[PDB]
XYZ file of C-alpha atoms in Angstrom:
455
model
C -30.120 -32.360 30.691
C -27.096 -34.058 32.395
C -25.509 -35.882 29.416
C -25.196 -34.579 25.790
C -25.602 -30.985 24.560
C -28.199 -31.052 21.816
C -26.826 -29.284 18.757
C -29.129 -28.491 15.807
C -29.601 -30.739 12.792
C -26.914 -30.567 10.067
C -29.875 -30.435 7.593
C -30.680 -26.881 8.865
C -27.269 -25.803 10.347
C -24.252 -26.912 8.208
C -21.577 -26.042 10.779
C -22.610 -28.931 13.108
C -21.676 -31.720 10.599
C -19.379 -34.314 12.223
C -15.619 -33.616 12.189
C -14.156 -36.101 9.694
C -11.058 -36.469 7.497
C -13.164 -35.496 4.448
C -14.036 -32.018 5.893
C -11.585 -30.912 8.669
C -7.922 -31.732 9.430
C -5.573 -30.671 12.256
C -1.904 -29.601 12.693
C -6.026 -25.817 21.491
C -5.491 -27.595 18.104
C -3.887 -26.005 15.004
C -5.976 -26.003 11.792
C -4.207 -27.780 8.905
C -7.218 -27.421 6.625
C -10.919 -27.846 5.991
C -13.984 -26.906 4.020
C -14.802 -23.190 4.233
C -17.767 -24.091 6.471
C -15.573 -25.956 8.969
C -12.967 -23.142 8.997
C -15.733 -20.683 9.887
C -16.848 -23.094 12.639
C -13.349 -23.172 14.225
C -12.880 -19.420 13.569
C -15.936 -18.847 15.775
C -15.814 -21.964 17.985
C -17.907 -22.531 21.152
C -15.258 -24.391 23.214
C -12.447 -21.794 22.914
C -11.288 -18.587 21.184
C -8.354 -18.738 18.761
C -6.659 -15.314 18.148
C -3.871 -16.865 16.082
C -6.364 -18.401 13.623
C -8.413 -15.149 13.675
C -5.369 -13.098 12.539
C -4.205 -15.555 9.862
C -7.684 -16.161 8.435
C -8.373 -12.464 8.029
C -5.056 -11.907 6.203
C -5.323 -15.021 4.045
C -9.124 -15.643 3.481
C -9.300 -13.852 0.132
C -7.119 -16.619 -1.380
C -10.052 -19.090 -0.961
C -13.231 -17.000 -0.315
C -14.781 -13.676 -1.376
C -15.372 -10.970 1.290
C -19.130 -10.974 0.515
C -19.166 -14.801 0.961
C -17.256 -14.514 4.247
C -19.777 -12.024 5.655
C -22.627 -14.343 4.496
C -20.994 -17.343 6.189
C -20.475 -15.393 9.462
C -24.119 -14.180 9.352
C -25.189 -17.790 8.684
C -23.029 -18.956 11.684
C -24.690 -16.218 13.792
C -28.280 -17.209 12.925
C -28.282 -20.471 14.921
C -31.581 -22.437 15.008
C -32.645 -23.204 18.612
C -35.137 -25.611 20.276
C -38.928 -25.237 19.947
C -39.801 -22.206 22.178
C -42.953 -23.372 24.184
C -45.965 -21.136 25.003
C -44.505 -20.510 28.494
C -41.254 -19.252 26.917
C -43.093 -17.267 24.162
C -44.776 -15.228 26.911
C -41.447 -15.034 28.859
C -39.784 -13.074 26.027
C -42.349 -10.215 26.334
C -35.792 -14.216 29.312
C -37.085 -17.817 28.823
C -37.630 -20.582 31.433
C -37.099 -24.005 29.694
C -33.942 -25.785 31.026
C -32.817 -27.081 27.605
C -33.541 -23.647 26.023
C -31.475 -21.910 28.740
C -28.613 -24.401 28.318
C -28.444 -24.258 24.500
C -28.112 -20.440 24.782
C -25.493 -20.079 27.550
C -23.340 -23.025 26.337
C -23.577 -22.840 22.478
C -25.360 -19.697 21.190
C -23.994 -17.003 23.518
C -20.257 -17.817 22.991
C -20.550 -18.491 19.206
C -22.172 -15.056 18.707
C -19.567 -13.310 20.907
C -16.754 -14.814 18.819
C -18.395 -13.811 15.523
C -18.537 -10.245 16.838
C -14.832 -10.290 17.787
C -14.048 -11.404 14.189
C -15.977 -8.365 12.893
C -13.952 -6.129 15.305
C -10.719 -7.629 13.938
C -11.953 -7.349 10.306
C -12.823 -3.618 10.548
C -9.724 -2.725 12.621
C -7.034 -4.316 10.500
C -8.609 -5.073 7.080
C -10.966 -2.084 6.613
C -9.793 -1.737 2.946
C -12.274 -4.569 2.145
C -15.148 -2.223 3.045
C -13.537 0.718 1.246
C -13.242 -1.394 -1.936
C -16.921 -2.514 -1.666
C -19.437 -0.148 -0.037
C -22.281 -2.674 -0.504
C -20.310 -4.960 1.868
C -19.975 -2.105 4.337
C -23.740 -1.481 4.181
C -24.426 -5.216 4.800
C -22.141 -5.418 7.861
C -23.745 -2.272 9.355
C -27.336 -3.356 8.514
C -26.530 -6.650 10.316
C -24.674 -5.015 13.247
C -27.580 -2.624 14.051
C -30.057 -5.571 14.144
C -28.374 -7.619 16.968
C -30.199 -9.181 19.980
C -29.719 -6.408 22.558
C -28.492 -7.348 26.038
C -25.012 -8.945 26.362
C -23.935 -7.908 22.814
C -24.347 -4.124 23.282
C -20.741 -3.260 24.191
C -19.503 -5.443 21.291
C -21.835 -3.845 18.693
C -20.834 -0.355 19.885
C -17.086 -1.167 19.769
C -17.400 -2.261 16.107
C -19.395 0.920 15.376
C -16.756 2.943 17.257
C -14.027 1.426 15.038
C -16.039 1.973 11.822
C -16.511 5.691 12.634
C -12.746 6.034 13.349
C -11.817 4.308 10.060
C -14.383 6.325 8.018
C -13.144 9.700 9.369
C -9.546 8.893 8.295
C -10.970 9.842 4.860
C 15.145 13.492 14.834
C 16.337 16.410 12.552
C 16.402 16.275 8.654
C 19.063 17.482 6.137
C 18.687 20.265 3.481
C 17.302 19.712 -0.040
C 20.014 19.484 -2.728
C 19.717 21.520 -5.969
C 21.797 21.588 -9.159
C 21.106 23.302 -12.563
C 17.322 23.137 -12.122
C 16.155 25.557 -9.405
C 13.094 25.076 -7.100
C 9.478 25.680 -8.154
C 10.297 25.351 -11.889
C 9.322 21.918 -13.284
C 10.029 23.041 -16.904
C 13.777 22.365 -16.529
C 13.438 19.053 -14.579
C 15.457 16.078 -15.899
C 18.021 13.404 -14.770
C 21.097 15.627 -15.433
C 19.495 18.943 -14.277
C 18.431 17.849 -10.729
C 20.996 16.951 -8.036
C 21.784 13.165 -7.982
C 21.460 12.929 -4.189
C 17.958 14.462 -4.322
C 16.807 12.245 -7.210
C 17.773 9.271 -5.029
C 16.249 10.768 -1.853
C 12.991 11.573 -3.622
C 12.853 8.158 -5.323
C 13.632 6.518 -1.966
C 10.770 8.517 -0.377
C 8.388 7.650 -3.221
C 9.432 3.972 -3.173
C 9.308 3.627 0.651
C 5.801 5.160 0.694
C 4.697 2.731 -2.026
C 6.276 -0.066 0.052
C 4.390 0.847 3.291
C 0.956 0.715 1.606
C 1.323 -2.926 0.455
C -0.907 -5.114 2.650
C -0.158 -8.825 3.175
C -3.674 -9.475 1.667
C -2.368 -8.397 -1.765
C 0.375 -11.047 -1.736
C -1.562 -14.090 -0.435
C -3.074 -16.402 -3.081
C -0.828 -15.013 -5.885
C -3.860 -12.709 -6.441
C -1.802 -10.032 -8.271
C -1.638 -12.479 -11.268
C -5.381 -13.264 -11.659
C -8.336 -11.944 -13.720
C -9.534 -9.288 -11.207
C -6.070 -8.484 -9.824
C -6.777 -4.738 -9.982
C -9.103 -4.677 -6.941
C -7.304 -7.275 -4.759
C -3.682 -5.947 -5.259
C -3.855 -2.179 -5.962
C -0.778 -1.068 -3.939
C 1.279 -4.091 -5.022
C 0.566 -3.168 -8.643
C 1.557 0.500 -8.155
C 4.928 -0.630 -6.731
C 5.537 -2.894 -9.739
C 4.381 -0.288 -12.254
C 6.648 2.338 -10.659
C 9.627 -0.029 -10.879
C 8.846 -0.778 -14.521
C 8.348 2.885 -15.428
C 11.515 4.041 -13.634
C 13.640 1.142 -14.924
C 12.494 2.010 -18.486
C 13.170 5.711 -17.802
C 16.821 5.103 -16.773
C 17.194 3.088 -19.972
C 15.506 5.831 -22.074
C 17.772 8.507 -20.616
C 20.947 6.538 -21.513
C 20.111 5.286 -25.008
C 18.424 8.535 -26.131
C 21.596 10.466 -25.347
C 22.900 10.025 -28.893
C 26.091 11.990 -28.327
C 28.789 9.750 -26.812
C 30.186 12.180 -24.238
C 26.679 12.920 -22.920
C 25.731 9.246 -22.752
C 28.883 8.607 -20.653
C 27.970 11.478 -18.283
C 24.376 10.153 -18.086
C 25.569 6.621 -17.198
C 27.891 7.944 -14.469
C 25.085 10.094 -13.050
C 22.927 6.928 -12.811
C 25.802 5.026 -11.122
C 26.050 8.014 -8.767
C 22.289 7.762 -8.074
C 22.814 4.009 -7.495
C 25.384 4.845 -4.756
C 22.987 7.171 -2.922
C 20.377 4.370 -3.026
C 22.990 1.994 -1.490
C 23.715 4.488 1.308
C 19.975 5.038 1.958
C 19.483 1.206 1.930
C 16.976 1.501 -0.937
C 17.680 -1.844 -2.601
C 14.591 -1.486 -4.826
C 16.251 1.477 -6.520
C 19.661 -0.232 -6.646
C 17.903 -3.048 -8.487
C 15.796 -0.754 -10.649
C 19.093 0.729 -11.868
C 20.742 -2.737 -12.100
C 17.885 -4.017 -14.343
C 18.170 -0.902 -16.540
C 21.939 -1.377 -17.141
C 21.384 -5.178 -17.461
C 18.805 -4.609 -20.226
C 19.582 -5.637 -23.781
C 19.601 -2.082 -25.200
C 21.981 -0.828 -22.475
C 24.334 -3.816 -21.758
C 25.613 -3.999 -25.374
C 26.811 -0.348 -25.305
C 30.326 -1.592 -24.642
C 32.152 1.606 -25.622
C 30.050 3.639 -23.126
C 30.815 1.242 -20.251
C 34.486 1.357 -21.258
C 34.564 5.193 -20.943
C 33.402 4.990 -17.296
C 35.911 5.345 -14.462
C 37.527 2.248 -12.878
C 35.771 3.028 -9.597
C 32.351 3.674 -11.178
C 32.382 0.386 -13.142
C 33.300 -1.378 -9.858
C 30.391 0.093 -7.833
C 28.011 -1.049 -10.581
C 29.547 -4.547 -10.628
C 29.103 -4.863 -6.824
C 25.434 -3.861 -7.235
C 25.082 -6.548 -9.929
C 26.885 -8.939 -7.484
C 23.919 -8.571 -5.059
C 21.497 -9.913 -7.692
C 23.360 -12.993 -8.996
C 23.306 -16.554 -7.598
C 19.584 -16.196 -6.748
C 20.139 -12.946 -4.789
C 22.690 -14.528 -2.379
C 24.782 -11.492 -1.312
C 21.533 -9.456 -1.220
C 19.757 -11.758 1.258
C 22.762 -11.609 3.629
C 22.999 -7.828 3.020
C 19.322 -7.811 4.097
C 18.832 -8.302 7.873
C 22.375 -6.985 8.516
C 21.157 -3.379 8.388
C 19.393 -0.669 10.425
C 16.362 0.962 8.695
C 15.013 3.209 7.272
C 15.186 0.796 4.322
C 13.289 -0.303 1.202
C 14.071 -3.943 0.394
C 13.907 -5.431 -3.094
C 10.323 -6.384 -3.817
C 10.665 -8.803 -6.770
C 12.509 -11.365 -4.616
C 9.589 -11.468 -2.137
C 7.173 -11.992 -5.054
C 9.229 -14.895 -6.407
C 9.762 -16.578 -2.999
C 5.970 -16.393 -2.425
C 5.116 -17.573 -5.970
C 7.238 -20.738 -5.571
C 5.496 -21.481 -2.240
C 2.122 -21.101 -4.026
C 3.014 -23.376 -6.977
C 4.729 -25.853 -4.593
C 1.589 -26.137 -2.429
C -1.808 -26.732 -4.074
C -4.854 -24.975 -2.627
C -7.173 -27.977 -2.305
C -6.125 -31.171 -0.387
C -8.130 -33.569 -2.638
C -8.382 -36.603 -0.262
C -11.009 -38.732 -2.135
C -10.660 -29.099 0.912
C -8.765 -25.833 1.533
C -5.096 -26.039 2.558
C -5.081 -23.425 5.319
C -1.621 -24.529 6.521
C -0.333 -23.337 3.119
C -1.876 -19.935 3.790
C -0.372 -19.775 7.308
C 3.142 -20.390 5.958
C 2.551 -17.623 3.352
C 1.290 -15.313 6.162
C 4.564 -15.904 8.055
C 6.470 -15.066 4.833
C 4.419 -11.833 4.509
C 5.358 -11.072 8.152
C 8.916 -10.439 6.910
C 7.544 -7.548 4.757
C 5.916 -5.892 7.858
C 9.378 -5.435 9.462
C 10.462 -2.583 7.092
C 7.114 -0.674 6.871
C 7.855 0.824 10.311
C 10.852 3.188 10.711
C 10.305 5.777 7.917
C 12.812 8.091 6.194
C 14.197 11.325 7.707
C 14.204 13.275 4.417
C 12.112 16.229 3.243
C 9.569 15.578 0.495
C 9.979 17.957 -2.479
C 6.470 18.286 -4.020
C 7.494 19.193 -7.586
C 10.141 16.465 -7.847
C 7.632 14.079 -6.226
C 5.249 14.786 -9.105
C 7.986 14.681 -11.793
C 8.790 11.126 -10.751
C 5.146 10.110 -10.172
C 4.056 11.307 -13.661
C 6.883 9.696 -15.682
C 5.714 7.947 -18.854
C 8.701 6.856 -20.960
C 6.609 4.281 -22.867
C 4.149 6.886 -24.184
C 1.043 5.690 -26.022
C 3.147 2.656 -27.177
C 3.168 -0.723 -25.432
C 6.101 -2.116 -23.412
C 7.281 -4.440 -26.195
C 6.836 -1.610 -28.745
C 8.981 0.740 -26.572
C 11.807 -1.731 -25.789
C 11.937 -2.631 -29.527
C 12.542 1.080 -30.144
C 15.285 1.140 -27.476
C 17.129 -1.764 -29.116
C 17.097 -0.282 -32.613
C 18.033 3.131 -31.147
C 20.884 1.377 -29.297
C 22.260 -0.125 -32.552
C 21.811 3.343 -34.109
C 24.008 5.027 -31.424
C 26.562 2.168 -31.212
C 26.633 -0.003 -34.392
C 28.154 -3.488 -34.531
C 31.885 -3.558 -35.306
C 33.782 -3.063 -37.477
C 31.791 0.140 -38.186
C 32.826 3.716 -37.471
C 30.975 5.586 -34.688
C 28.238 8.088 -35.462
C 29.460 11.483 -34.213
C 25.885 12.464 -33.243
C 25.641 16.037 -32.010
C 24.369 16.989 -28.577
C 20.563 17.386 -28.217
C 20.524 19.435 -24.968
C 22.913 22.180 -23.792
C 22.947 21.798 -19.949
C 26.299 21.250 -18.254
C 27.314 17.567 -18.056
C 29.480 18.327 -14.992
C 28.233 16.278 -12.037
C 27.927 18.070 -8.645
C 28.999 14.754 -7.145
C 27.177 12.988 -4.343
C 28.590 14.716 -1.158
C 26.196 16.860 0.926
């Protein structure tokens, strides 16, 4: 017992297979990649702890391994086979005496178990939503945590329990609310031209910033919002995207369904006015929601409507469109030259991740998971974390909140069925020239006069 530490057989303990190029690859050393087994070994290594790798793994692991499979691998890493007891030691349990038995425990078993526990602590602290999404997983973790060899692990078991109870039991002056033709507590009259344009923006900025905060880096790693069971692994992500879609299609609907020309012009200005308030609140998601709406096929062709806008109002719009063009060049410099609160544009993060994930392949195929890929994506998701911090100093307005949350411009029709309708409706309200205009009469009777953006 003064030479080589005797590890178990790799026939009965996979993790102890020899470090080779065909199962583990580097850049305490940085993990470039490995087999899932060898990642779990380094994640819970005997020689040293590795907080950096702990954090990154737990963000990124769902891109190469199911939560249930992770828990099973950790449990497997925990249940380490040890040397033949001996009758002397078998009595001694009723701590053992054998030199080799004592050494295998203190040097290999004791630390490996301690590190597995710290991973559980980190898992339930930061990524508890795994256990919320699957209660059978939560039962497994607990039914394994309660059955741990009680002496030096007791504080660690109780700290994970303490966290799990805390997580379970979870389930600077502001300005005045602006009102227009619609008056509070009366949802009946609620519409784009009846509510005050500043408060539409404020409420959309509040809704969109809240939807922003709830997106976890987990949902973005692995491109997992574009896969077969995307619903479970990217629920907040999807809400954000669906909102954007639904609101973009609403702004369109509002414009093109105003058949009367004068109304449509007032409706387009009101949207450009809402776009300004987004700019001032630094809600670029809403600036771009509006931009997309006006840059849609049904809207963009309405040349006579755009021509009846004011010089200044066309210019604002064109500077918002300026942000988007040349692969979002002005936008990216406009971002990180600003003090929050702020909601950045989400689509550009999704693209810049998606090109990283096509440009790097997940296996390493050397005649093997690319964890370095995942680390670089984790760093890219760290940019998102920056603006889910300083929230907005605006008062939520419950009824408006719900008006915007329960928008459904598409109806029981599909997206491509609805946008088809928009295009034909667009041609119906502004035909191709030379053709005389339709003098379509007004549908509503509310005042078109804008209250105009100053609080």
